[PDB]
């Protein structure tokens, strides 16, 4: 009948309008996220410069998302799929360093020792391509026991502890910015 085709055509037109509206919203959010990522990417490169120079190689998993190995989730999507910590009411706002500071504080003050770790996050390759990768994360004991750390001057326990706390916070911030832009 003609009325059934008209109703179906109107429904598909409404679906196309909704998807185009969400495309425009996602385009604005992606432009803002790329504008912030242009600043936040050298900051992450500077944070990774220390680990690149010391060549620390060799657990813990930090799964970045939105709404034996210990896995800590940042976002409701991993809890929907699957839980030491779950971040709720996230993704409606762009990430900041306060969020990365809260995540790193919760990881380090959890009381669970870890030697090596990775940050499972979606790095930004291009506009149409994003790659799920990981960034190595080392604790205080994994850094003090390294071979190259004897070449680094003025290192007591307090300095290295404070350094890995802030370096973890900076790496979580850099992964959050790249994951938000990729998403």
């Amino acid at each position: 009948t003609l009325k059934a085709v008209s109703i179906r055509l109107k429904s598909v037109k409404n679906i196309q309008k909704i998807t185009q509206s969400m495309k425009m919203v996602s385009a604005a959010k992606y432009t803002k996220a790329e504008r912030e990522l242009r600043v936040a990417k050298p900051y992450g490169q500077g944070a990774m410069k220390f680990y690149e120079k010391t060549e620390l190689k060799g657990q813990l998993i930090i799964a970045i998302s939105s709404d034996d190995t210990m896995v800590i989730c940042v976002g409701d999507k991993i809890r929907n799929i699957l839980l030491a910590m779950v971040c709720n009411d996230f993704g409606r706002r762009p990430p900041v360093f306060e969020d990365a500071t809260k995540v790193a504080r919760a990881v380090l003050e959890s009381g669970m020792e870890f030697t090596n770790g990775k940050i499972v996050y979606n790095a930004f390759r291009s506009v149409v391509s994003f790659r799920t990768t990981d960034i190595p994360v080392f604790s205080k004991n994994a850094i003090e026991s390294a071979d190259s750390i004897a070449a680094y001057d003025s290192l007591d326990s307090d300095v290295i502890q404070s350094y890995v706390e802030y370096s973890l916070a900076s790496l979580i911030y850099y992964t959050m910015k790249e994951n938000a832009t990729s998403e």
Binding site: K17, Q20, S21, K23, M24, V25, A28, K29, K32
Partner: protein, 273 residues
């Protein structure tokens, strides 16, 4: 309705002849046919009862010829022929917005333009419920005064921009500042176009209020008080700055000096608003 179908068929032609007397005597006349769908129904019944060959929807083969010979008598006569005019405002009642029906298709193809009234806009309280994107006038800005054409070109462009950007931004928040500016300007213009019943308001007050709409003067007030601005600001320029209106009427347009004067008047009124 209690009158016979021949009387309903004849009444538009009787009224057209009465209007054409004024047209041919140098006077100007406006005629309203409310509505031409009832005349087409009456002519369909007469043609069916006269054993004439029907066509689509049992209408005869000359309903188009019926409405075209009715509506071709509205004309602007030459100055050597008197200079008079007859203006036609036919009315078409459609069923569930079916524009593609036979009689609405014929009347749309005959006339010089259409004014679309929307049931959805009427039930939203938007009165008059004129669909701007569907309303066409082929005469266009040639049928306007200088001041009205000057402001309505910018108003039509801004409303077209608002119609383009408000489809995908019904409730979006993370948007550009330009899109939010276009949304705010379109909301001001749409609230400006609303009007009550039985209240025409002359060309001068209309030009003034939509000039205030397009120059960003109403971006600092709530849309719900925009009609209250119409209730007050025009009265202010009717009691404080009559010389500005006199200069506008003398020049016929809005000079940049009058633009500065009106900007100062608007700022002074909004300071006390």
């Amino acid at each position: 309705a209690s009158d016979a179908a021949p009387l309903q068929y004849l009444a538009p032609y009787s009224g057209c002849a009465m209007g054409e007397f004024f047209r041919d005597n140098g006077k100007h006349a406006l005629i309203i046919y409310d509505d031409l769908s009832k005349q087409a129904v009456a002519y369909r019944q007469m043609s069916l009862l006269l054993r004439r060959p029907p066509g689509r929807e049992a209408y005869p083969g000359d309903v188009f010829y019926l409405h075209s010979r009715l509506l071709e008598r509205a004309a602007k006569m030459s100055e050597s022929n008197g200079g008079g005019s007859l203006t036609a405002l036919p009315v078409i009642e459609t069923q569930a917005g079916d524009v593609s029906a036979y009689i609405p298709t014929n009347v749309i193809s005959i006339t010089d333009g259409q004014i679309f009234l929307e049931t959805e806009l009427f039930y939203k309280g938007i009165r008059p419920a004129i669909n701007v994107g569907l309303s066409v006038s082929r005469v266009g800005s040639a049928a306007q005064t200088r001041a009205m054409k000057q402001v309505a070109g910018s108003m039509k462009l801004e409303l077209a921009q608002y119609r383009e950007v408000a489809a995908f931004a019904q409730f979006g928040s993370d948007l550009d500042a330009s899109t939010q500016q276009l949304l705010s300007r379109g909301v001001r213009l749409t609230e400006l176009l609303k009007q009550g019943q039985y209240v025409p308001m002359a060309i001068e007050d209309q030009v003034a209020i939509i000039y205030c709409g397009v120059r960003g003067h109403l971006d600092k007030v709530e849309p719900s008080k925009i009609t209250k601005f119409e209730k007050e600001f025009s009265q202010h320029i009717k009691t404080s700055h009559r010389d500005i209106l006199d200069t506008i009427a003398k020049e016929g347009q809005i000079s940049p000096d009058t633009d500065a004067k009106l900007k100062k008047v608007v700022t002074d009124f909004l300071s006390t608003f």
